[PDB]
């Protein structure tokens, strides 16, 4: 039933369809009568559901499309490791990581870029990167350039190998539908092999290669003296001297005498004092534990041998009193719509990516990461934004599933139909929460801003005045500090020093210290929840009311993406499921841009800084977060006006491009306001008068010009609005820490 069925020679491989544009769609295949045909050519290129009503052809296109995408990611990664080999200071960073900055680029000696090739240490003049690959490759044990050179070539070979697969599958050997619908086989294979065995094999690296290499390097031996990884396998005397657990061999493993391997499989639960980062042995014990869990977890499902569940069975049983049939029918939707799968995967993968960034800063998992304050903010800020984008995509495809693939027969009194039937109560109460919080979250800032201007500093919501202490977070914080003793007693240190413990000092820099929570930190956590709630209100409303509304009952027939119904009914503007996503992106932004500042200003103020040998820490901004982060003027004064001094003064230095990129984004941003505020009606009339001038001089175009569509105008704006916003704070974050 999970057999492999493959069609042979589905489609040829001729070049003629390249010459024929718009072949995928019938309307576009006719010809380009107007300029909107051009914009529609791109907007429908990847929408395979519109090209064909056949699910099998859609699935084959998607499966092959992923392979070409992996080629891009591998090529992007293969070039990263390549720049580390040739155009980089990696070999110098290894010997002196603290006092040498990481660089991987060399601008050429032309019109005047050469100032950007600044002195980053190690005899290399180049741009100071912030991706942290130097910390990654060091954890991988890559101690020379040739080891780095060989890895780049393998990615390109792996890249073309992925590319050959999509050709082999779409043109020569196409799997049929039933091969794709075997979700049970898919989950087992990915859980056990991709996630399980991939983690298990990586533990083989940590145990044989990285931890011996890292344990030597941090002990003071030069990279010249460090043996290569292969020598550890052949000669075990070098390894046994570092990790004596290997003298027993593999016999303690099978005899369950796993205490013999305690030397190199630890539960220290803390950062290495020498190199700011988690212990490599803890990361070896990490992956080995998780691989067994993933290997075990994948045998749950049936796959042709009668041993395992049917996901259809489990869902149907989970009905209850309040939910009539519960999860009956979801397996059909999930197995008959790619959009539903994309919605679940995007939404949780995006929430996953946000969860990574919160972990990576508190417990740095690489050597010499926390000392590089530049990398931590850029690494934190990057993933925080990626997850926000993907979560919004999850709501979009949730609506596309509804307008397109929702069958009322399947969804009859199930958990989904029962949700659509009381959508008004869900939104009305969520509307109340958004108004409740926005008053009592932002209004408190206004009250403090009003009182501090009135000259009444005792009436503010502050630490000295009326205080709103996060006792529940202070409560949970205290448990993790006292955990290593009582709960999970095998741990020596607390899980993260962010919760509590003692200041860890790598060189002169503090890697991590306890993050105290006060009224100012109370005043920001809810601002995220408030902005997150509104983002859900816009997006959730888009999913439920996409099919119908009291204003429009036939919203489904119009489609997921339509601008309006018309002027009447008071106005039907931005009513589609598409336009909800267009609005949610602005709130996905405002939800997210405060998160990166709450991380940026706090860590500079309370955590990041320089420490003296005596034990006195001098933070970067000196505790200004406590009293200034409770008023809107303090953010404008102490965070935006103050920290942006390096950017504007970056001209005539290596950071001068950040001053340009910080500024060019402001242009691109306001350029967005053209398309959001305006409307097509003005622009087509203006183009009409301009067309007359070309008719006069006989320069009239054959493809008759047309203004951008209504949905496109909203689309082009949010593209600029976000690109101008993110690119602005991108350079501000870079130039501030790269100087500080």
């Amino acid at each position: 039933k999970a057999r492999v069925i493959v069609d042979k020679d589905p489609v040829p491989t001729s070049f003629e369809k390249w010459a024929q544009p718009g072949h995928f769609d019938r309307t576009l295949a006719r010809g380009p009568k107007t300029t909107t045909w051009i914009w529609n050519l791109h907007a429908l290129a990847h929408d395979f559901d519109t090209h064909t009503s056949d699910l099998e052809d859609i699935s084959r296109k998607i499966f092959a499309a992923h392979f070409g995408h992996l080629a891009v990611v591998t090529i992007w990664l293969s070039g990263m490791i390549f720049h580390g080999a040739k155009f980089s200071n990696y070999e110098a960073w290894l010997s002196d990581p603290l006092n040498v900055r990481p660089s991987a680029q060399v601008v050429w000696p032309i019109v005047g870029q050469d100032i950007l090739n600044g002195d980053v240490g190690g005899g290399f003049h180049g741009i100071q990167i912030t991706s942290g690959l130097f910390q990654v490759w060091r954890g991988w044990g890559i101690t020379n350039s040739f080891q780095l050179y060989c890895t780049a070539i393998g990615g390109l070979v792996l890249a073309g190998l992925f590319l050959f697969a999509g050709w082999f599958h779409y043109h020569k050997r196409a799997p049929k539908l039933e091969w794709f619908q075997n979700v049970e086989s898919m989950l087992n294979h990915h859980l056990q092999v991709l996630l399980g065995c991939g983690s298990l094999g990586w533990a083989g690296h940590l145990i044989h290669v990285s931890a011996p290499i890292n344990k030597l390097m941090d002990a003071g031996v030069a990279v010249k003296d460090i043996p290569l990884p292969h020598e550890f396998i052949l000669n075990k005397s070098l390894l046994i001297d570092l990790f004596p657990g290997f003298a027993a061999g593999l016999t303690p493993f099978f005899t369950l005498n796993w205490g013999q391997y305690a030397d190199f499989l630890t539960f220290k639960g803390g950062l290495n004092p020498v190199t700011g980062g988690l212990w490599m042995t803890d990361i070896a014990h990490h992956h080995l534990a998780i691989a067994v869990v993933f290997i075990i977890a994948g045998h749950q499902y049936r796959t042709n041998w009668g041993i395992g569940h049917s996901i259809k069975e489990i869902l149907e049983n989970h009905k209850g009193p309040f939910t009539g049939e519960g999860h009956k029918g979801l397996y059909e939707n999930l197995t008959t719509s790619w959009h539903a799968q994309l919605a679940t995967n995007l939404a949780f993968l995006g929430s996953l990516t946000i969860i990574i960034a919160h972990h990576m800063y508190a417990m740095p998992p690489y050597p010499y990461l926390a000392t590089d304050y530049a990398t931590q903010l850029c690494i934190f800020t990057h993933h925080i934004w990626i997850g926000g984008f993907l979560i919004v995509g999850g709501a979009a495809h949730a609506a596309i599933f509804m307008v397109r693939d929702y069958d009322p027969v399947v969804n009859q009194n199930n958990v989904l139909d029962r949700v659509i039937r009381h959508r008004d109560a869900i939104i009305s109460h969520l509307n109340w929460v958004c108004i409740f919080l926005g008053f009592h979250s932002f209004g408190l800032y206004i009250h403090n801003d009003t009182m501090r201007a009135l000259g009444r500093p005792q009436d503010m919501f502050s630490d000295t005045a009326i205080q709103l202490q996060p006792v529940f977070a202070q409560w949970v914080q205290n448990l993790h500090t006292l955990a290593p003793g009582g709960t999970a007693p095998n741990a020596l240190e607390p899980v993260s020093y962010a919760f509590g413990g003692g200041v860890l000092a790598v060189g002169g820099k503090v890697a991590m210290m306890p993050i105290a929570l006060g009224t100012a930190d109370f005043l920001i956590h809810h601002i995220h929840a408030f902005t997150i709630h509104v983002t859900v209100l816009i997006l959730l409303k888009g999913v439920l009311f996409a099919r119908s509304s009291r204003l429009i009952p036939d919203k489904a027939n119009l489609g997921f993406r339509f601008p309006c119904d018309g002027p009447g009914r008071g106005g039907t503007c931005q009513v589609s499921g598409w336009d909800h996503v267009f609005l949610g992106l602005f709130w996905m932004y405002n939800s997210l841009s405060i998160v990166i500042f709450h991380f940026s200003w706090k860590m500079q103020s309370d955590v990041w800084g320089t420490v003296d040998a005596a034990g006195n820490v001098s933070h970067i901004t000196g505790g200004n977060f406590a009293q200034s982060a409770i008023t809107i003027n303090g953010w404008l004064r102490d965070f935006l006006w103050a920290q942006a001094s390096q950017v504007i003064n970056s001209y005539g230095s290596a950071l001068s491009a950040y001053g340009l990129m910080f500024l060019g984004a402001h242009f691109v941003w306001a350029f967005s306001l053209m398309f959001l505020f305006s409307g097509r009606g003005y622009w087509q009339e203006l183009i009409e008068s301009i067309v007359w001038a070309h008719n006069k001089l006989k320069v009239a175009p054959a493809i008759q010009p047309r203004a951008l569509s209504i949905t496109q105008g909203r689309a082009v704006g949010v593209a600029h609005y976000l690109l101008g916003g993110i690119a602005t704070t991108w350079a501000f974050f870079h130039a501030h820490i790269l100087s500080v």
Binding site: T255, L256, N257, A262, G306, I307
Partner: protein, 73 residues
């Protein structure tokens, strides 16, 4: 760093016992124990096939590994 273990024959007894719990837990619970790969005797092995054998034995090792280590505090 837990203390060493010497691989006594008592550990072999616990593993055999832990399997027998899984096997009794398997037959009374598994819906489709029979499978395509058939075993030589349909009495000494019951209605189980080669998949159900590896399944019941595998869950037994999980329990036996937990018990042997759990008892070894």
């Amino acid at each position: 760093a837990t203390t060493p273990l010497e691989w006594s024959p008592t550990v072999g007894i616990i593993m055999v016992i832990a399997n027998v719990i899984a096997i009794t837990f398997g037959r009374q619970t598994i819906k489709y124990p029979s499978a395509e790969p058939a075993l030589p005797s349909a009495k000494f092995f019951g209605g189980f096939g080669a998949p159900a054998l590896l399944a019941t034995t595998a869950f037994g090792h999980i329990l036996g590994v937990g018990l042997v280590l759990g008892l070894h505090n």
